[PDB]
Write an enzyme that holds these catalytic residues in place. Structure first.
Site, PDB file in Angstrom:
ATOM      1  N   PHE A 189     -15.255  -3.915 -12.151  1.00  0.00           N
ATOM      2  CA  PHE A 189     -14.424  -4.312 -13.280  1.00  0.00           C
ATOM      3  C   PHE A 189     -14.777  -3.428 -14.479  1.00  0.00           C
ATOM      4  O   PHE A 189     -14.027  -2.503 -14.815  1.00  0.00           O
ATOM      5  CB  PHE A 189     -14.634  -5.810 -13.570  1.00  0.00           C
ATOM      6  CG  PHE A 189     -13.807  -6.358 -14.712  1.00  0.00           C
ATOM      7  CD1 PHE A 189     -12.730  -5.649 -15.234  1.00  0.00           C
ATOM      8  CD2 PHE A 189     -14.120  -7.597 -15.267  1.00  0.00           C
ATOM      9  CE1 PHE A 189     -11.986  -6.157 -16.291  1.00  0.00           C
ATOM     10  CE2 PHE A 189     -13.375  -8.113 -16.324  1.00  0.00           C
ATOM     11  CZ  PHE A 189     -12.305  -7.391 -16.834  1.00  0.00           C
TER      12      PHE A 189
ATOM     13  N   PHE B  83     -15.558  -1.392 -23.783  1.00  0.00           N
ATOM     14  CA  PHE B  83     -15.943  -1.453 -22.391  1.00  0.00           C
ATOM     15  C   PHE B  83     -15.537  -0.183 -21.681  1.00  0.00           C
ATOM     16  O   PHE B  83     -14.561   0.480 -22.030  1.00  0.00           O
ATOM     17  CB  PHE B  83     -15.367  -2.662 -21.673  1.00  0.00           C
ATOM     18  CG  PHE B  83     -13.883  -2.792 -21.801  1.00  0.00           C
ATOM     19  CD1 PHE B  83     -13.328  -3.344 -22.943  1.00  0.00           C
ATOM     20  CD2 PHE B  83     -13.051  -2.399 -20.769  1.00  0.00           C
ATOM     21  CE1 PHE B  83     -11.964  -3.483 -23.069  1.00  0.00           C
ATOM     22  CE2 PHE B  83     -11.681  -2.549 -20.888  1.00  0.00           C
ATOM     23  CZ  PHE B  83     -11.141  -3.087 -22.038  1.00  0.00           C
TER      24      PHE B  83
ATOM     25  N   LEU C 166      -4.716  -5.118 -18.905  1.00  0.00           N
ATOM     26  CA  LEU C 166      -5.150  -5.003 -20.285  1.00  0.00           C
ATOM     27  C   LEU C 166      -4.228  -4.125 -21.121  1.00  0.00           C
ATOM     28  O   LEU C 166      -4.347  -4.137 -22.347  1.00  0.00           O
ATOM     29  CB  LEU C 166      -6.578  -4.457 -20.342  1.00  0.00           C
ATOM     30  CG  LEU C 166      -7.611  -5.362 -19.666  1.00  0.00           C
ATOM     31  CD1 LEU C 166      -9.001  -4.763 -19.828  1.00  0.00           C
ATOM     32  CD2 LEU C 166      -7.542  -6.768 -20.248  1.00  0.00           C
TER      33      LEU C 166
ATOM     34  N   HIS D 125      -5.586  -4.106 -25.364  1.00  0.00           N
ATOM     35  CA  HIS D 125      -6.815  -3.433 -25.753  1.00  0.00           C
ATOM     36  C   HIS D 125      -6.515  -1.960 -25.996  1.00  0.00           C
ATOM     37  O   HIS D 125      -5.791  -1.339 -25.213  1.00  0.00           O
ATOM     38  CB  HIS D 125      -7.861  -3.588 -24.639  1.00  0.00           C
ATOM     39  CG  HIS D 125      -8.276  -5.012 -24.427  1.00  0.00           C
ATOM     40  ND1 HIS D 125      -9.375  -5.565 -25.050  1.00  0.00           N
ATOM     41  CD2 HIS D 125      -7.693  -6.020 -23.730  1.00  0.00           C
ATOM     42  CE1 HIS D 125      -9.469  -6.845 -24.724  1.00  0.00           C
ATOM     43  NE2 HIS D 125      -8.458  -7.146 -23.929  1.00  0.00           N
TER      44      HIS D 125
END
Length: 164
Positions: A59, A112, A121, A125
């Site tokens: 992930f 991240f 996402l 993001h």
């Protein structure tokens, strides 16, 4: 023209290796500059010595909370938060560098590193960079993570700065 920043990663104090990122300052200048300045520490605070507090294998690796070391802190060079700059760039695969947040226009210092394609996402993001060298070091970091994100060893940014 795009800056290159590096982290030297340490595991329980032992050197692991170096990761360098390309930052896409051409497309997200305000976001890229925040990460660049936090990586050099030139504003008086930044990532040096901070940890990766959440690592979910398959992930992502999440870090950048240099005030509370657990996902509840951090701050940008612009203040406590700043806006979503744009969503031009997408989460297309491993090595993408994107901003963590807590809702619209809540970017701080947490980020991240994606280790898989995370297309859900997109538009939520802000993507602002990509691993340039040392993807293999990111893959080694992943082996210290767990399903719930807790790390089995302390993963720290022992040193960081600008290469180009």
């Amino acid at each position: 023209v795009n800056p290159t920043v590096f982290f030297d990663i340490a595991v329980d104090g032992e050197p692991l290796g170096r990761v360098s990122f390309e930052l896409f300052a051409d497309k997200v200048p305000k976001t890229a500059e925040n990460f660049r300045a936090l990586s050099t520490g030139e504003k008086g605070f930044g990532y040096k010595g901070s940890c990766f507090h959440r690592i979910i294998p398959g992930f992502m690796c999440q870090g950048g909370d240099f005030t509370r070391h657990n996902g509840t802190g951090g701050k940008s060079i612009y203040g406590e938060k700043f806006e979503d700059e744009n969503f031009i760039l997408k989460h297309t695969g491993p090595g993408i560098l994107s901003m963590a947040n807590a809702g619209p226009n809540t970017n701080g210092s947490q980020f991240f590193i994606c280790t898989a394609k995370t297309e859900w996402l997109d538009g939520k993001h802000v993507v602002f960079g990509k691993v340039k060298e040392g993807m293999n070091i990111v893959e080694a970091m992943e082996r210290f993570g767990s399903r719930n994100g807790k790390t089995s060893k302390k993963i720290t940014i022992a040193d960081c700065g600008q290469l180009e």
